[PDB]
Amino acid sequence: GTHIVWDFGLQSSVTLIIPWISGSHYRMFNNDAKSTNANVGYVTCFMQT
Amino acid sequence: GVPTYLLPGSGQFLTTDDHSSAPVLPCFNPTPEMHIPGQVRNMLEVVQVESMMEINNTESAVGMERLKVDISALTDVDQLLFNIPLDIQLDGPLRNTLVGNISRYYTHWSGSLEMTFMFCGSFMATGKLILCYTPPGGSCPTTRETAMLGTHIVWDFGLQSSVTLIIPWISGSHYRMFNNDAKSTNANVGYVTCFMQTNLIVPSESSDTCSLIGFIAAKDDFSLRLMRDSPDIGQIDHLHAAEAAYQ
Amino acid sequence: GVPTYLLPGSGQFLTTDDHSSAPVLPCFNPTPEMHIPGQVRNMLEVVQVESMMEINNTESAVGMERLKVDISALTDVDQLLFNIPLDIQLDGPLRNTLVGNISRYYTHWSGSLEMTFMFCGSFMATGKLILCYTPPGGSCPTTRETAMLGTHIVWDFGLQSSVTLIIPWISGSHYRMFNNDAKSTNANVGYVTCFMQTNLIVPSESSDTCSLIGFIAAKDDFSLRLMRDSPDIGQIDHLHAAEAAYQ
Amino acid sequence: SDRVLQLKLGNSAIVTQEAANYCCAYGEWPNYLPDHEAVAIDKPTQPETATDRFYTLKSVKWEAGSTGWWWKLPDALNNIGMFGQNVQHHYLYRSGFLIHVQCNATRFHQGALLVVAIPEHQRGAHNTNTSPGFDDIMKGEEGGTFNHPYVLDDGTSLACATIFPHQWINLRTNNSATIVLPWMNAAPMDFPLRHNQWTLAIIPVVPLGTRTMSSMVPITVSIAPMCCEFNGLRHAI
Amino acid sequence: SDRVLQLKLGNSAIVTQEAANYCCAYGEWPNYLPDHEAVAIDKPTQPETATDRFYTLKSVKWEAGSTGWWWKLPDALNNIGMFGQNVQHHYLYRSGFLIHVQCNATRFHQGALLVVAIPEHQRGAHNTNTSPGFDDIMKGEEGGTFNHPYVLDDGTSLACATIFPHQWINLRTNNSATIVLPWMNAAPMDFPLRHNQWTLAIIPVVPLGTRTMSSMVPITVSIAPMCCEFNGLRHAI
Amino acid sequence: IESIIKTATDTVKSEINAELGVVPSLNAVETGATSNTEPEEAIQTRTVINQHGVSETLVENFLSRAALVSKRSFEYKDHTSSAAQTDKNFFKWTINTRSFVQLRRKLELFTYLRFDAEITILTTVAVNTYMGLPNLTLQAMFVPTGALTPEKQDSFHWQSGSNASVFFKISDPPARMTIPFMCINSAYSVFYDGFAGFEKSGLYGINPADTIGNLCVRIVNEHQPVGFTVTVRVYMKPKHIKAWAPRPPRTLPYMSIANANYKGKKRAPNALNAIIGNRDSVKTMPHNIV
Amino acid sequence: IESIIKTATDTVKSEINAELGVVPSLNAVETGATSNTEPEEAIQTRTVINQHGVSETLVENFLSRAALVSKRSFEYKDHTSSAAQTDKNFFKWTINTRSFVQLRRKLELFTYLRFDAEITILTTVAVNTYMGLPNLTLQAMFVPTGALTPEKQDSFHWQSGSNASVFFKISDPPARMTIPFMCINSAYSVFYDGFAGFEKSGLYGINPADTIGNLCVRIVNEHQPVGFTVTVRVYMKPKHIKAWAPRPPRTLPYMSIANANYKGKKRAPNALNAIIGNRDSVKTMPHNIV
Amino acid sequence: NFYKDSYAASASKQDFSQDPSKFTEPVVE
Amino acid sequence: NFYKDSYAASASKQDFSQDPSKFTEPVVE
């Protein structure tokens, strides 16, 4: 999926843009987190090296 | 005089050399040219004429039974009727064709092919078939699910009793070889399979078994090169009365 | 007819002759040319690419240990680290290079060379070296006093981890020969030596032994002529399965 | 539009309502011999409406174990009408041909005919090295039957016989086939009694089959000579 | 200026802060196949953002007795993502590659990596005359290990392997290397399951060494296909 | 329409085609015409600029190959006590192209041919102990069909007052001369559906216009005390070739040079009832990838 | 930038250079680029007008050398009572460039080659007592990969209806003919990292497009009463050469013609663990002037 | 061709005119 | 070259174009 590979160093920060990838225009703040109109997805971090 | 020196290859007889030689009949006047119908100036004119495949190259198919494929009504859906080996060099259904015999005088070939299938049942016989060309890499597809994922044509029987399955030139480089290894990556063409798209439905007074005739030609992007002798003829002895030519 | 006469050299087969010969396949149409990356039109393009010297061509240096020179901290000043035999024809550190292998297909050579040395210690490792090229005539210089009187470069380690020692074309006439006499006045190039200019000073958490990798290429004033066979390959028997080509 | 066809030659005419597009052999149409290709210097007779007209041969019965039929031209016409009288009284002939082959059945019948006109069909005999004799070749009006039609009785192949000017009679589609033949010879004119130039072959590639009542299905051949010239007038042999 | 680099392909991006100037192989950049060099006549699929994106292989541990690692392309990617699905469903492929190799350590570590992309690396086996079999060549995603990296496992020389498109990861200087590979074949397209065209080799010319604490140093390979075309659509094998 | 074709035809890109009334894939085989369905009309194509030359399938290149037409070993010795059927230092050959089957099947792909024949004669010699190979002089005299062929080595027909002879040695390059297009017709009849004479007991299939003549070849030398086996091979290259009305290729083996008789092989391939070798079923694929 | 180079480059005079910020001798090997340091930038030079032509290192001149590719001695005698593996007055040869190692190592300096092959055939003969050397006629027929090779000396595949044969004698100059660029690809694959077929039991490293064909060579003569040893050598000269992607030269000895397998020599030079022969230390100079 | 007869010349391999439609489309419409 | 095929010609030894920078400077800046 959408990712960024980040090397530590002189610039100590990256930005992971989470793009607006949705069916229609808006998402709801529903209490059902697993709904198709409310779930955004997941952000995970791994060791690249 | 002119100082000359002989090169390597002097005095040899190459059978493909192109030189002028001595006329044996000086001031001979040949017969005047007459217009004769059907002049061939390039053998790719002949290769573009369709000719019958022997898809029924099986035992108990004797002579002209080999030129037609008998289809019948089926009680199961999506069934394989026949498949055609596209191996031209090895002895398959494409060898004794105009595109097959002229190409076996050559080693390399290129370009598209067209398979034509004429339905030769009654007028009352109806049906739909799917004619699938599969590019190489895997096995020959046995189910219709697997086979229709490639190049195909769906054919309804009727007033026009023939379709063309264009077999497109889908190859890595420009040419393919007529290698004896049919499974090589530079010689394998792929597979052509036919399935029932629906079924052959005939009435009670029509014959319940109908026939297809398969044709194949080459298109005008077709090409041949690297001329070799044909495997399709040979001899181990002299022909009869060939000694009488010396008597 | 034309009065001719044959010269000496008629009917010979010189293997370097340049003539036209009979085509074995008339009207053959070759495969169309495609753009392929990395075309070589002159072998002096290849000779200008740097490639690793085996300066550590010693016993107990096994395989890739031969491609690097280990330097350490020293307690005496001005010490010799390594020297490089510039004998390309005889088997030294320059033989298995791109400049070394292509030149052994030739007898005469000319032009400048460049030696590149990459320091492969830690970032915390500091040091200064002096890389001295000595023109021929005497012995190889063992002390730094003697060696620095010739062509040299003094190199500080740091953000740019490589220097180039240009070995200039300093010769009597235009070319040098790849003679088996390394000590000849028309074949000897000279010597390259390396000394500690100061010392290798590392901290306690860095590795106390650091490595150099030596590269060599040719410049664009480099030249080669008088082509000969290479000493770098040979055979006394047939290769395996070479009899199977006749079966 | 290409299924109805009327072929009017002389006092003869053939209408057909299930045709294909007709075949002109090698893209050529019959003509008379021009002056720059003429050889025989005497003035030829051109009996136009008397000989350029359809002649209908005897119908052959189309059965289950049929192998095929062949007629050699002009041998199938050398005894019929005023074409045959001009053949017997002259030494040289030159003509094209318009072959129309008729075969119809019901919409419950199946079968396919390869109707092919073969130039210079030198026949071969099977399982012997003696050449075919005069009576095995010159069958006349009745024509012959293919012994081994799968090889066209000459060691060649029926599968590649579509290189020759041909049509099909597929009973699903059409009931007639028409081939227009030009003069096909290395010679301008020819002796018609010892040389045949076109062989009309009619071959059951798909055999006749039905499950309705079994009527007789025949195959009828109507051949019209086209642009007949005749040189070398003498007595009839 | 040539040390920071961001490589954005598809939905993927790699930033690096200690780079060298990246390598374009033979001065060439990947493109699609033009019409004057095309062979296969069917319309190719160009799944642009779905396949032209970085794919990260499994990291390998960089040790004291390491000889080296190799991945063959496209064999290292024939089962990954939508590149692998387009490979399995099509007969022909054509793509370039953007290889990014990651390896970092502290400023007390030393070591040099020859990161070299070898075109048509036909391997050889040692001390035998039997050719390398299918399982010895087609290692897939995991890749292989060099048996004798001093001769590049083919009788040639590691010293002259800088004639090939390469970079170095010298831990003193940089922590990444980037090679941009074009299509490298005598053929316009190719069958991806039986032919590998680029071998990425990663070789310890100077081994890993330090005297500080011994962390695991891995080497990670991110490979982006570039300008993928696919012809010959069929089922997956 | 007649046009000049030097390379194979290009491919145009095509798109989705969903139009009523237009069925390019449906054809009528009953008309006798070959399908006109383009690859652009059956599947969706790209633009391909096709640069493949078509010059090796030219009928000139397909037929101008020097092929063997004759081959005789004959004993070169003293023949005063030999049989009546032996070749006494000479042979005659009625020239045909139907004895060796590679050239025969290739020429019989056409009904009519008009070509000039380029004849190459290759003589080789073997000692019939070994003492060396003599450089013998041979005479190949071209006797037309209608003249008298010699009956001896030293007969007086070999003086060749008007017959064209070539005198050549074994150590030379092979003797080469061009025979013109010598038919009384405008083309040779490769196949002749007819009889050669006006009586009904003629030969079928042999047009007398097609026969070039005789090729009488002797050794001009008198005999040595030892004998030799002299093999003469004749090679014909057609040139300046026009071809008409192409034919189905012969599938069965030839039986004779005089006719198109057929037996076929005993089993498939190239049998009388099975030209292609058999497989198990019509849905059996022989070379299937496993 | 691509330019035309006919001679080696000149040298410009330089002076004392003591400028901050400009370090032409410092380089970055990590980028993968070769050093750009000029001799004018490292030491102080003079002006040298360099007239040394670069035309002998052209890839055409480096590769257009006629090199041996094939060599067979075969016994020329009566072979009615010989073994099954012997050459009975003929041999076949699958054409490769990988049997003799001088041409092999030179061609394997590149990944792709596009060239026309100029083939020279040199036949020599020895008496197998001595009575003289016969002027034998040989036939070298070029059989492509896909056709049938002969199984006898007097087989009927030698008539060469379409296969290109050359007929040549021993006393002649050597037979020479040009083979074109015959690959189905745009270049030959000198190295092929792949498998030849679609099943997994193919051959590794042998692209079938690279193979030219077969070279069947017989003696046209019948046997003499004595035997002879006929040695046929084939020489290939590449011409009209384009070359791509140069490679490291092979250092270890070749083991087979079918693969790039390596053993190395037992000790240095050209051993598996030591390509260059050893010296005593890194500060030992072997050819030192005393 | 220094010979006086025109049939003595070498093979004429430059006849690139085709007409496939006399064999593939021999129909009248 | 009296032969009709263009590959029959002698060796073409006049191609003096070079580009060493595709092997010596393959970097993008």
Numbering used by the authors:
A (entry chain B): 150 to 198
B (entry chain B), C (entry chain B): 1 to 247
D (entry chain C), E (entry chain C): 10 to 246
F (entry chain A), G (entry chain A): 1 to 128, 134 to 295
H (entry chain D), I (entry chain D): 30 to 58
Paper text:
EV-D68 is an atypical enterovirus that usually causes mild respiratory tract disease, but is also associated with severe lower respiratory tract infections and acute flaccid myelitis. Following receptor binding and endocytosis, virus particles uncoat by forming a proteinaceous pore spanning the endosomal membrane through which they eject their genome into the cytosol. In this study, we showed that EV-D68-947 is a dual receptor-binding virus that can use both sialylated glycans and sGAGs as receptors. Structures of EV-D68-947 were determined after incubation of the virus either in the absence of a receptor analogue, with 6′SLN (a sialylated trisaccharide), with dp6 (a heparin-derived hexasaccharide), or with LMWH at 33 °C.
Similarly, EV-D68-947 infection was neutralized by soluble heparan sulfate as well as fondaparinux (sulfated pentasaccharide) and dp6 (a heparin-derived hexasaccharide). We did not observe density corresponding to dp6 or LMWH in the EV-D68-947 structure, either because these ligands, in contrast to Sia, interact with the virus via a multitude of low-affinity and/or transient electrostatic interactions or because the bound ligands do not occupy all icosahedral symmetry related sites. Structural analyses showed that, like 6′SLN, both sGAG analogues induced movements of the VP1 GH loop into the VP1 hydrophobic pocket, causing displacement of the pocket factor, as previously observed. By contrast, determination of the ratio between the number of EV-D68-947 full and empty particles after 1 h incubation at 33 °C showed that the sGAG analogues dp6 and LMWH, but not 6’SLN, promoted genome release. Unfortunately, we were unable to determine the exact binding site of sGAGs on the EV-D68-947 particle by cryo-EM.
